[PDB]
Design a protein around this ligand. Structure first.
Ligand SMILES: [K+]
Lengths: 1183, 66, 144
């Protein structure tokens, strides 16, 4: 029994359905987005656009439909949600309770998305009084939303609309004027298509736009009319009827757009226009994907969008009930969205399907244009040819980040700080990119200025104390200093007074306008009136460290010699009488900033070579005298007296931490170790409060926060300095340096998630590998339906010739501007073509900087699949690059052509590729697995074993018992894991004495395998298409030495439906000094981990917590939770995480009911659930 | 018997076969992320995938016997 | 809580479940159902499979009450064992040339089919195509 405990770290960020409205009840307006199972509410900012996330809630089910409405006269919008099980819910918001109040449920059908069970398509009436649910079969139900005088929602009985053998493409109800309500549907019959032996009813059968009628008085649903369409139809808008504009639907379809009211209405058609100078196949049409009714009291205009990123401002024209013109006019070109919303005061929320999410502010209203408007009234047989064009109306307010779809994640360290980074190659088309993920606190980037040299320490200190703006930026090199001034156009300044030919070791403000620098030849007291009080160093000694204050200057030379200065009420210096010398040199000291109440601070924590921190008073009564010394485990580098009652901290010579309260006797401590690189305690300002930005391997931060302690890192790579900052660019920031940079950073956040940086790419990256030796990356990039660079080039020039061929003065040229701009494929879409077209690009990239190393481009119809940098046995110590290629994948129906394998030599410290040879193979290669100094290739159905020859590969060994088809392959150093596409994993042992491949173990349970990552010699941690993580252990009864597929088997230990698709498993340790964790990333952009336990007592504790938490608190959308994870398989031996972590969210009387039901206090329960995350994952609390 | 998909002592392989096709495609439409899989796999848009599925609802497995 | 107390019940259910009498088959089959519902998601299957192999040949029996208890028995074995192993012990004589065994295997197949059809999607056996029609769902066969 090895039970597992799910958990999550980054929620799925893929938008699929965005409706909006007023759920606060107020004038303000909020957007219900919907993720895969994570419902989420947002709020834009009407002043700077930052979308501040407010509520997020799991529903543990499948969100299949999502429509808002509002009853007559109400001001609080609701939400309807359709479930996977045959029960519909209605929600409601609570602005103070901060949760979703359920209202009512109805039971009408079975569970699971069947055919005849409704829940698929959801129709609401625009008056809120009726609502309709409808499957893709006979069962269509209509409800009536009556409100009584008790301010609730008295729902009614279900209304039967059974009808044998029909389909439904789409259902949206009709804006009728206070009548028996009308519901539209694009039906399709097929009972004609079920008897013909010749089978011509697959043709000659088209949609009817049947309308449905409720009868309130007589309590039955009757059908209104039925009229045949012409061409097949995707989605439909309801035209706003009532007293403003006519009542109809306008059917978008294959290349046309068609109004069709019922009545005596004649039906306009108008075709969808095409771009100037297409680069496509003219076989493919163009349809729409989304629609956005902008209902205003005075008028309305639509904004719908094509495939290729084109928003159309359809300005409808009509009569009182007749229709006159559907004239068209484009709005602009943005990236692709799947649903989007328009917000008042002109906000547009472009919600992409892939990658980032956008938010546009409408800068120019109305129709102010020079490109001509189109119409349906024009005679044309030729379609309208319009211009593509840059961004002209809209402006991009903010770029909301997302990560979906995460394809191939690897967890590894490719830098010099402790934490393993997350390299994720994810994207879609030419918008794809490579993203570096880290996990520390939200470091806000402010300024970048790269300089030659090595800055060590750079302060930002005021000139005068009254200012909320600082004065200078002091970039101290090794051989000089760079002095900068904040004139908001920051350049090198001269009249600062410093003039640092020597490096600056501290910057402090002693006088009211007197700045003090610390340099190895002395101390230069610099009043704002340019007077120089230069202190000289006696002898050839150098100053090492110092301890500054607003009235005290404590320094330390070589020899442990303390020289104390004093600020007068006049503002000048007086040297203290006794220079207290030490037995060891001073490695670090600490003196606080003075409080405004007292005139001086007492303590002086002095770290030495003697490894004994010493407490020294600086009062005039006991100044420079011993108080208490205390030995230390290592040699510190810095010390900092900080606040949030007196505090001190001690950083060791590795990235570990201890604590020390500031006192004549020390009492409190909690240690934290998350280090191998020494700690630098530098002063910061966290929202009006001081903390210690400890700089180690990472830039760590321990802070008291109302005595809620946290050891917290920064979400950025290695740094070496910090201080405060205040300017017009950033009134509260952090000045940070590293090797060969100069940056301004900032910290503003209390919460903790991943924070990232991204690298641009070209195609959709299938897979990449690490170079071991030089530590570089090998990206392979592959698209279906694409043109490569050369075919794009000579295609454009050939089409230019084809525009010289048009037989006419050829008295002027379009080519002079037409050969100028290649549109950036980042934003201007992509020239998609073909059915068997392919492309391929292979790239090397360095993750420290941004730049690329080598580029290879390939054949048109030959696209790269796999790669493994491997050394071979019988050759030298040199790595290669292998690439498999397939040929002409007519993918549906599957018919392929062949394969080839390249070989690149990987020279120049892995920084330049070169071709060596090429070999043929009759079928698609899908496997490059290095193995015992040779490479393995599993091709098609026949598993093979190759080796390098000087002109080709030299086939040695080959299996053919493998039944269907071979997808992937992974090997422990002896045994071989075969990833069969229908059957489960197949264990293969190879005879080295005989050259023979042997299958000895199998499964009876066919799983649609994608990926795997192994843990030991006997357990295989697989995945699935649909979302079933599975692990199968080999029994120790399996005879290793042998000669349905096998009588012996391998038994399941785990089956756990996730609900999304998992792509790259990797067991690792996320935090330093931690434990094992089997990380699953998933397709929708999320990250999930897995957990091993300690004891059956802990496990049955959590199990009883499940036993009571399920029925004593049901899920939100009414999904039977055990029947949700138990969807395909019976679940075996997993404890869910997020179900059992709603104790932080339930009602306090039920906290009493459950916590006292198990006889345990809620601080004990919540502390127990703190312990798991602080143990394994990214939790930050400091004991 | 009145439920759709009930077999009996005369139902043939074409009937059972086209039934498991039709509820297969209804299941494909029924999920929410396998469409994102097919849209990432071959390069399309999701509405194109939905429309191709709904058009291949009445086509596939062709004409019957005889 | 009777999950650790099933093992000694199994040979007890062997002399019970062996072919003696109507009350044994009927009530003991109801015990198969109730046990099968008590253990649901609780870490026990192979015992129940060893039950299942003794359950299965009892199907061809003429009395309607005891075949009814066989039906609900197979419904409990459906919900605990899973749909896969039910269907794998189902597909044998679906097309057998005899109406008597066909009424049987179709009837069990309908009682499988109404309950949780949506789970059957992955567990369909793939059948390769003839000349006239396409039988391969390539949707289950796309490769990245
Ligand atoms: K030392």
């Amino acid at each position: 029994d090895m039970f597992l405990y799910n958990l999550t770290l980054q929620r799925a960020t893929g938008i699929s359905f965005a409706i909006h409205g007023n759920f606060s009840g107020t004038k303000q307006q909020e957007i219900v987005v919907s993720r895969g199972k994570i419902l989420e509410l947002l709020r834009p900012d009407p002043n700077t656009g930052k979308v501040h996330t407010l509520l997020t809630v799991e529903v543990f089910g499948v969100i299949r439909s999502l429509m808002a409405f509002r009853l007559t006269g109400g001001t609080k919008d609701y939400i309807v949600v359709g479930s996977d099980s045959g029960r519909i819910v209605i929600l409601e918001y609570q602005p103070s309770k901060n949760m979703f109040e359920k209202i009512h449920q109805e039971t009408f059908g079975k569970s699971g998305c069947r055919r005849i069970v409704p829940g698929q398509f959801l129709a609401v009436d625009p008056k809120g009084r009726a609502v309709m649910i409808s499957a893709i079969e006979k069962q269509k139900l209509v409800y009536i939303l009556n409100r009584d005088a008790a301010a609730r929602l008295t729902i009614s009985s279900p209304l039967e609309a059974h009808k044998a053998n029909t389909l439904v493409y789409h259902v949206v109800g009709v804006d009728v004027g206070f009548e028996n309500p009308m519901f539209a549907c694009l039906e399709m019959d097929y009972e004609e298509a079920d008897n013909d032996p010749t089978g011509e009813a697959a043709a000659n059968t088209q949609q009817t736009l049947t309308f449905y009628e409720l009868d309130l008085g007589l309590n039955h649903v009757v059908r209104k009319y039925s009229e045949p369409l012409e061409e097949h139809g995707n989605f439909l808008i309801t035209v706003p009827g009532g007293s403003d504009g006519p009542s109809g639907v306008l059917i978008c379809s294959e290349n046309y757009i068609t109004y069709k009211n019922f009545g005596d209405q004649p039906d306009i058609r108008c075709p969808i226009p095409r771009r100037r100078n297409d680069l496509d196949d003219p076989e493919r049409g163009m349809i729409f994907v989304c629609s956005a009714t902008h209902k205003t009291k005075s008028m309305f205009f639509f904004l719908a969008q094509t495939e290729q990123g084109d928003i159309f401002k359809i300005t409808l024209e009509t009569d009182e009930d007749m229709v006159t013109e559907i004239r068209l006019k484009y709005f602009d070109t943005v990236p692709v969205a799947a649903a989007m919303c328009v917000l008042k005061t002109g906000f547009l929320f472009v919600a992409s399907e892939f990658g980032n999410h956008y938010l546009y502010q409408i800068a120019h209203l109305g129709d102010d244009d020079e490109e001509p408007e189109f119409s349906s009234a024009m005679p044309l047989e030729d379609t309208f040819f319009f211009q593509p064009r840059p961004l002209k109306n809209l402006v991009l307010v903010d770029e909301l980040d997302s990560l979906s779809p995460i394809l191939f994640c690897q967890i590894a360290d490719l830098a010099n700080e402790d934490t393993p980074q997350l390299y994720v190659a994810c994207g879609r088309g030419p918008r794809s990119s490579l993203r570096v993920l880290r996990h520390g606190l939200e470091v806000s980037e402010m300024a970048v200025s790269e300089l030659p040299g090595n800055p060590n320490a750079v302060w930002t200190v005021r000139r005068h104390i009254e200012d909320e703006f600082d004065a200078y930026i002091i970039v101290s090199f090794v051989n000089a200093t760079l002095v900068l001034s904040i004139g908001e156009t920051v350049e090198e300044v001269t009249d600062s007074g410093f003039l640092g030919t020597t490096p600056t070791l501290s910057c402090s403000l002693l006088g009211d306008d007197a700045l003090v620098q610390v340099y190895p030849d002395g101390i230069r007291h610099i009043r704002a009136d340019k007077r120089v009080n230069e202190w000289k160093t006696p002898g050839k000694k150098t100053i090492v460290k110092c301890a500054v204050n607003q009235r005290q200057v404590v320094i330390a030379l070589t020899g442990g010699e303390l020289v104390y200065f004093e600020m007068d009420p006049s503002g000048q210096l007086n040297e203290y009488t006794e220079r207290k010398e030490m037995s060891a040199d001073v490695v670090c000291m600490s003196l606080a900033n003075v409080p405004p109440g007292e005139q001086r601070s007492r303590f002086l924590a002095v770290g030495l070579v003697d490894n004994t921190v010493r407490i020294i008073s600086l009062d005039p009564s006991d100044c420079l005298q011993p108080l208490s010394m205390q030995a230390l485990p290592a040699q510190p580098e810095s010390l900092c007296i900080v606040e949030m009652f007196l505090y001190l901290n001690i950083g060791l010579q590795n990235g570990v931490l201890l604590r020390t309260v500031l006192d004549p006797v020390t009492g409190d401590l909690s240690d934290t170790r998350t280090g191998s690189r020494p700690v630098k305690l530098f002063r910061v300002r966290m929202q009006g409060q001081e903390a210690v930005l400890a700089m180690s391997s990472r830039s760590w931060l321990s802070y008291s926060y109302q005595s809620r302690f946290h050891l917290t890192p920064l979400s950025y790579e290695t740094l070496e300095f910090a201080s405060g900052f205040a300017s017009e660019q950033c009134p509260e920031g952090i000045v940070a340096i590293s090797t060969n940079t100069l940056r301004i950073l900032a910290l503003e956040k209390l919460g903790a998630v991943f924070n990232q940086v991204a690298f641009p790419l070209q195609y959709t990256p299938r897979k990449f590998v690490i170079h071991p030796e030089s530590n570089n990356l090998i990206i392979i990039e592959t698209d279906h339906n694409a043109y490569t660079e050369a075919t794009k080039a000579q295609r454009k020039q050939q089409m230019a010739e084809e525009m010289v061929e048009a037989a006419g003065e050829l008295a002027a040229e379009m080519a002079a501007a037409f050969l100028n701009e290649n549109l950036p494929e980042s934003i201007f879409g992509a020239p998609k073509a073909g059915n068997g077209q392919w492309a391929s690009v292979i790239r090397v990239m360095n993750p420290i900087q941004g730049n690329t190393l080598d580029l290879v481009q390939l054949e048109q119809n030959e696209a790269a699949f796999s790669v493994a940098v491997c050394r071979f046995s019988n050759t030298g110590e040199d790595w290669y690059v292998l690439v498999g290629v397939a040929k002409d994948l007519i993918l549906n129906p599957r018919s392929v052509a062949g394969g080839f394998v390249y070989t690149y030599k990987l020279v120049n410290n892995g920084e330049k590729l070169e071709f060596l040879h090429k070999t043929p193979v009759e079928e698609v290669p899908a496997a490059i697995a290095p193995f015992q100094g040779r490479v393995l290739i599993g091709v098609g159905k026949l598993l093979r074993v190759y080796d390098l020859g000087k002109k080709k590969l030299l086939r040695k060994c080959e299996n053919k018992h493998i039944a269907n088809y071979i997808s992937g392959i992974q090997t422990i150093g002896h045994r071989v894991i075969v990833s069969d596409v229908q059957e489960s994993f197949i264990w293969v042992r190879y005879k080295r004495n005989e050259n023979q491949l042997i299958i000895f173990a199998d499964d009876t349970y066919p799983r649609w395998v994608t990926t795997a990552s192994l843990l030991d010699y006997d357990t295989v941690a697989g995945a699935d298409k649909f979302g079933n993580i599975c692990v199968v252990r080999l029994p120790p009864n399996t005879n290793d030495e042998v000669d349905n597929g096998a009588s012996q088997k391998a038994e399941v230990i785990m089956n756990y439906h996730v609900g999304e698709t998992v792509l790259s498993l990797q067991k690792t340790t996320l935090i330093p000094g931690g434990s094992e964790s089997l990380v699953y990333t998933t397709l929708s952009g999320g990250i999930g981990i897995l957990v091993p336990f300690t004891s059956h007592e802990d496990h049955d504790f959590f199990q009883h917590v499940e036993m009571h938490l399920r029925s004593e608190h049901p899920p939100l959308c009414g999904r039977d939770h055990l029947s949700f994870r138990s969807y395909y398989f019976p679940v075996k031996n997993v404890i869910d995480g997020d179900l059992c972590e709603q104790f932080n969210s339930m009602e306090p009387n039920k906290q009493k009911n459950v916590s006292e039901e198990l006889d345990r206090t809620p601080p004990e329960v919540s502390k127990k659930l703190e312990d798991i995350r602080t143990r394994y994952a990214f939790d930050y609390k400091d004991d | 018997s009145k439920y759709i998909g009930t077999g009996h002592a005369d139902t043939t392989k074409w009937e059972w076969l086209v039934n498991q096709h039709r509820d297969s495609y209804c299941s494909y439409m029924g999920h929410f992320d396998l469409l994102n899989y097919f849209a990432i796999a071959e390069n399309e848009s999701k509405a194109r995938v939905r429309f191709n599925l709904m058009e291949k609802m009445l086509q596939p497995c062709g004409p019957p016997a005889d | 809580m009777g999950k650790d107390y099933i093992y000694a019940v199994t040979p007890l259910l062997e002399d019970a479940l062996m072919d003696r009498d109507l009350v044994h088959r009927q009530t003991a089959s109801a015990v198969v159902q109730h046990m099968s519902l008590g253990v649901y998601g609780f870490g026990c299957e192979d015992s129940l499979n060893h039950l299942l192999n003794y359950v299965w040949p009892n199907v061809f029996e003429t009395s309607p009450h005891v075949i009814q208890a066989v039906m609900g028995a197979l419904e409990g074995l459906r919900v605990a064992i899973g749909p896969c192993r039910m269907l794998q012990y189902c597909l044998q004589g679906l097309f057998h040339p005899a109406r008597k065994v066909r009424d049987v295997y179709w009837k069990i197949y309908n009682s499988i089919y109404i309950g949780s059809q949506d789970a059957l999607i992955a567990h369909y056996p793939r059948i390769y195509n003839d000349d006239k029609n396409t039988y391969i769902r390539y949707e289950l066969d796309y490769i990245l």
